Amino acid sequence: MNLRAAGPGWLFCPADRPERFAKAAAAADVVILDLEDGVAEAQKPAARNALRDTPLDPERTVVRINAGGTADQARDLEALAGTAYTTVMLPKAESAAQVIELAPRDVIALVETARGAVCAAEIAAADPTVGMMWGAEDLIATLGGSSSRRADGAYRDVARHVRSTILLAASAFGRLALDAVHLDILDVEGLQEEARDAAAVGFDVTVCIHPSQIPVVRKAYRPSHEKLAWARRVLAASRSERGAFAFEGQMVDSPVLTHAETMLRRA
Amino acid sequence: MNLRAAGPGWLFCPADRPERFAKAAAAADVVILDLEDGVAEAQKPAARNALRDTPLDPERTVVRINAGGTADQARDLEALAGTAYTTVMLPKAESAAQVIELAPRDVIALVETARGAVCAAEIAAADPTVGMMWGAEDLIATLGGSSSRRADGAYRDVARHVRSTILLAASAFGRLALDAVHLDILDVEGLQEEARDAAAVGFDVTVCIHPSQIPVVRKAYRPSHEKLAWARRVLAASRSERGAFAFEGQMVDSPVLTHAETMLRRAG
Amino acid sequence: NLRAAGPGWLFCPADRPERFAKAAAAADVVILDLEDGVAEAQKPAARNALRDTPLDPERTVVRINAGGTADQARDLEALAGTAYTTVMLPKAESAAQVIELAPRDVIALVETARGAVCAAEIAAADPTVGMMWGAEDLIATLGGSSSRRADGAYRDVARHVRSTILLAASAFGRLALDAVHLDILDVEGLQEEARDAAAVGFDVTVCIHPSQIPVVRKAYRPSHEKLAWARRVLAASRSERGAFAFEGQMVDSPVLTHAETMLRRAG
Ligand SMILES: CC(C)(COP(=O)(O)OP(=O)(O)OC[C@H]1O[C@@H](n2cnc3c(N)ncnc32)[C@H](O)[C@@H]1OP(=O)(O)O)[C@@H](O)C(=O)NCCC(=O)NCCSC(=O)C[C@](C)(O)C(=O)O
Ligand SMILES: CC(C)(COP(=O)(O)OP(=O)(O)OC[C@H]1O[C@@H](n2cnc3c(N)ncnc32)[C@H](O)[C@@H]1OP(=O)(O)O)[C@@H](O)C(=O)NCCC(=O)NCCSC(=O)C[C@](C)(O)C(=O)O
Ligand SMILES: [Cl-]
Ligand SMILES: [Cl-]
Ligand SMILES: [Cl-]
Ligand SMILES: [Cl-]
Ligand SMILES: [Cl-]
Ligand SMILES: [Mg+2]
Ligand SMILES: [Mg+2]
Ligand SMILES: [Mg+2]
């Protein structure tokens, strides 16, 4: 499954609403068909049914199953067997074992508890892992907290800390890195801010919970006109330089040039 | 010991000031009698005596002993053997071994050095551990630094980093989580900001160094009437919804409803 | 001995021997660079310069190329015919990479996700005498495009790695070196970074231009106000036992340690 080839705009779609699968697919780069928290306990069997009977392109679809050790997950895997879906998202991911027990599937580990943050490197390193995501809301919920963001809307420190932990663990083992959802759907400004930053630090994906968010996300992962203009400027300049040199008041060498090239590629 | 159901307002009181033990207990939800940095080396023997002579409710009292590998700690423990106290706070906690050697006692590990932060998971996992606290000042001290906060009062990055490290380590192992003391006694504004935020992210306790701070802390761990109203509205709303649903412009699913219920618990 | 020298350390590409003397005079320690400051085609010339224009080995570090690279092998061959005993290892990612540089002392430059994840093991390695972090390769290797946000602060993942390296170094009694300030003429920003670095116990701020050295050296010396407080509170402490209130603050041992650290940095 060529996840890196697909866009940065992924979308959660509750699996007990098969009448929306087609549109989610159309609006998003990758759809995450959700059997976990997006669907009530009593609608999960129906959700599983909808999953076998309403196929989306398995090359552009991931299924979030239920957490390790839950009876629900067992049901999910049985139902999954009647689909073409090769990639699953494991919520409350908390150990390498939880990932290993899903072989031979590809696994996107969703770290959203303190235990998962503590075990991030082991989780990322596990052989089936193809990506890591973080979730601020279960994180806060399982910490015994009540709020992931402060007054002004900025993530509180522990959420910011887990975000970095996941980005690092993912990158250290060559895994996709997926940034967290933006629950305030009409906060397009906040979303744009997060998604631009995500792209800047090397996240590959920002996950969305509403289709109106996908265009914002796609736009944000395209380098700004200003940044792109600089990239061309500094690269042209370096053609005439050997090793370190000063450009526009800044010391420039290898990795700075790599940043500019990455910007060009992203466009 | 039912520490988790004690209240979030803990108060340090140096153990060489027994005449102040009573005020301490009256003011706070839990008192930490201190044999370590709160008490000069020459006064520690008197503090060990005061420990025995002026007993407090052992259900609402923890004793901070001295660090592992010190002559002081050995005497602290000898003195504790003659008390009712079963829960100790271990300063400069730096390894699981330092916690384990304290069994069968319950141990709150106070991580306040780079080594302890680096071993936070191992320390939290140790069997006798029932809680984790962090300390910014010994952290900066042992780092070779000179201030834990920048000009505007915010903690410097390495301190904010260790705070999160300790919250996650504690919570990964089901331990109590205690937030760092607020040393600016007169800065009630900052204490309020910290305690509200601590409450928001799941710290169970904000440790105080002055009784005047306890009310500030207590008020901070109770959600706004505004947050409560919201919690009641979204929970009522969810009763007629299946799974994820949009509410007042927000996407709402399981953990959001948990947040709401947590508000209602911290309150009613 | 490196640990005895000032906090002002200066990179100088080793293909610029005519600059060596000025760098040595301007800075406490000089880091002669064989890696990213020098174009590949210029590396052999840089190695010759390293051999032909020596600096005081007690005040000089050589940054070699990364573990496993053909360049590093050539670097070490060149170095055998020098008096240099401390090297900086870029893209430091394991204890093993440090250990193979024995019997030299090693400053591990952590600047990749893998390096951040393995920071404690790298710091603990026997040859390690210090740790540095590199914001630009960190971002480059994460697949990102900028280490700093619009307001100039480092992005979170950079700030996160900064503390990781500081803690790892300190946990194992290693020197801690803060990242270069690429904006040469931005002495205001450099001052802010260095004052903060000194405050949290970094031992060195690395510079990329001689003009930055004075700024770093001043920032690592406490202000007159801070020095006055330090003398004040230490005086006050002798009349006090254990914890006591001083100027609105609670004071005990570690606060007095901070004071003494200010004094030491002042003479
Ligand atoms: C700062 C001090 C010395 C000033 O004490 P004061 O008497 O000079 O201040 P005050 O405002 O004049 O006190 C007035 C009233 O408050 C009482 N009072 C005041 N404080 C307390 C108290 N703690 N417990 C019980 N009662 C207290 C006091 O006795 C008096 O009662 P009164 O009106 O009836 O006469 C005092 O507040 C105190 O001792 N606080 C706690 C000190 C302590 O325990 N420090 C160790 C923990 S902090 C630490 O080590 C960091 C960490 C984590 O380790 C790391 O970051 O590295
Ligand atoms: C940027 C450059 C090329 C501008 O060079 P320039 O000639 O254009 O600058 P200048 O202002 O005109 O220089 C004025 C005078 O100072 C001198 N000078 C100026 N710089 C130095 C120096 N470093 N050492 C010794 N002398 C220096 C220079 O020779 C000249 O002498 P003069 O008065 O006789 O005319 C120059 O400053 C330089 O080479 N700086 C260091 C470059 C370097 O080593 N970069 C590698 C480390 S940064 C890195 O890789 C990232 C990291 C951590 O790995 C990751 O974040 O990933
Ligand atoms: Cl299918
Ligand atoms: Cl494995
Ligand atoms: Cl003393
Ligand atoms: Cl090149
Ligand atoms: Cl200063
Ligand atoms: Mg979740
Ligand atoms: Mg302390
Ligand atoms: Mg580099």
Q: What is the DSSP string of C58-104?
A: GGEEEE-PPTT-HHHHHHHHHHHTS---EEEETT---HHHHHTTTTS
Residue written as tokens 């890196």? A4
Of B12, B16, B117, which is closest to C167 when you measure between CB atoms? B117
Please, which experimental method was used? X-ray
Q: Please tell me chain A's helix, strand, coil percentages from 3-state DSSP, rounded to the nearest 5.
A: 50, 20, 35
Q: How far is CA A177 from CA A205, A206, B110, in A?
A: 7, 9, 33
Peptide bond into A104 cis (omega under 30): yes
Where exactly does CATH 3.20.20.60 map onto chain B? 1-223
Per the CB < 8 A criterion, the answer to whether A114 and B167 are in contact is: yes
Q: How far apart are CA B147 and CA C230, in angstroms?
A: 11
Give the right CATH number for C1-222 from 3.40.50.2300, 3.40.50.1000, 3.20.20.105, 3.20.20.60.
3.20.20.60
Cα-to-centroid distance, A229 and ligand 4 (Å) = 43
Residue B183, strand partner residues: none
- Is the Cβ pair A160, C161 closer than 8 Å? no
* Angle at alpha carbon of residue A33, lines to A30 and A37, rounded to 5°: 125
Contacts of C5 (CB under 8 A, 6+ apart): C28, C29, C59
User: Which SS3 state, helix, strand or coil, does residue A100 take?
Assistant: helix
Q: For residue A88, what is the enclosing H or E element?
A: strand A87-90
- Is the Cβ pair C142, A201 closer than 8 Å? yes
Chain C CB within 8 Å of residue B267 CB: no
CATH class assigned to B1-223: alpha beta
| Structure tokens, C232 | 């004040």
Q: Which of residues 134 through 153 in chain B touch C, CB cutoff 8 A? A: 135, 137-138, 140-147, 150
| Structure tokens, B56 | 């407090």
Query: Chain B: residue nearest C176 by CA?
Result: B143
Stated resolution in angstroms: 1.8
- Closest residue by Cα to atom 20, ligand 2, is C209
Q: Which of residues 177 through 216 in chain B touch A, CB cutoff 8 A? A: 177, 197, 199-202, 204
Per the CB < 8 A criterion, the answer to whether B52 and B70 are in contact is: no
Chain A CB within 8 Å of residue B244 CB: yes
Where exactly does CATH 3.20.20.60 map onto chain C? 1-222
Q: How far apart are CA B15 and CA A23, in angstroms?
A: 67
- Is the Cβ pair A43, B258 closer than 8 Å? no
Of C155, C185, C209, which is closest to A200 when you measure between CB atoms? C155
CA contacts within 13 A on the Cβ side of B106 = 17
Per the CB < 8 A criterion, the answer to whether C13 and C33 are in contact is: yes
Q: How far apart are CA A263 and CA A252, in angstroms?
A: 16
